[PDB]
């Protein structure tokens with residue numbers, strides 16, 4: 001009931017994160033870890049100066065925490081310096097502490113109020129956090145050192161199970177048909193939620209890839225295979241993707257959605273009920289013609305992309 005990890009987009013993310021920066025930057029990465037064990041925000045460890053730790057909320061926004069901990073785990077594996085092992089231990093403790101009883105992972109922790117409290121798939125936050133904890137649970141590199149004990153691994157396995165349970169319950173039923181996920185759901189009510197003003201309740205063409213990838217690392221029970229099949233069917237349906245089109249971000253001044261032979265496009269946001277791709281703006285509005293959007297949002301955010309390609313090709317590979 002296990003699928004290969006070869007080609008799994010989440011596994012790929014994680015193995016890349018192991019070597020994301022130069023090893024020489026391990027100390028600057030480390031210098032930003034908050035006391036609670038999470039990182040205060042996403043950072044370019046190639047341009048910034050040294051941090052001074054801190055006591056702010058940790059976050060999984062934009063790859064924060066989950067990237068740093070995979071990277072430091074590799075550095076520890078490679079170099080042996082225990083301060084990096086300790087950092088990784090606090091990061092994983094941070095992740096499990098952040099988890100609600102339902103299995104949901106918030107974007108910021110300690111909780112800050114507002115949308116950050118929600119179960120956050122945005123930026124592959126929750127799916128990739130669970131992928132990290134799962135690799136740690138299963139002694140997979142770079143977590144195949146002494147960084148964790150048997151009891152740690154049981155702790156993480158419990159976390160992954162609860163997170164899996166959350167994903168399965170949150171998966172959206174579109175007029176009776178299992179589909180995908182919103183970029184954020186209520187931690188306690190499982191309902192799709194808004195985030196920032198231009199991020200409305202919807203199916204996420206972006207984050208659902210990562211969610212499916214994460215499920216595909218899990219043992220494929222009947223209900224997990226159904227969920228992955230249903231999710232994959234949704235990505236691969238002519239009611240979901242635009243045919244003969246691509247998203248070209250360099251053309252966002254007026255319209256990034258352009259005719260392109262041999263190409264499919266997926267919307268960033270799909271209507272929960274009609275599966276109509278849509279657009280928003282800083283006024284919280286919802287509309288279907290990207291040219292009506294403010295210049296700043298059309299160029300400042302991706303309203304579509306090649307999202308489905310990687311999960312569809314992967315599902316093919318494994319016989320789904």
Ligand SMILES: O=C(O)[C@H]1O[C@H](O[C@@H]2[C@H](O)[C@@H](O)[C@@H](O[C@@H]3[C@H](O)[C@@H](O)[C@@H](O)O[C@@H]3C(=O)O)O[C@@H]2C(=O)O)[C@H](O)[C@@H](O)[C@H]1O
Pocket residue numbers: 062196300301302303
């Ligand atoms: O499509 C994307 O996900 C988008 O991500 C980045 O940009 C988004 C956003 O569009 C930006 O305006 C910027 O947002 C501001 C702050 O940086 C952020 O902390 C948050 O509070 O929202 C602020 C805002 O509303 O403007 O950064 C956002 C982010 O990092 O998620 C990329 O820069 C963008 O090119 C695209 O990939």
Ligand SMILES: [Ca+2]
Pocket residue numbers: 062123
């Ligand atoms: Ca983002």
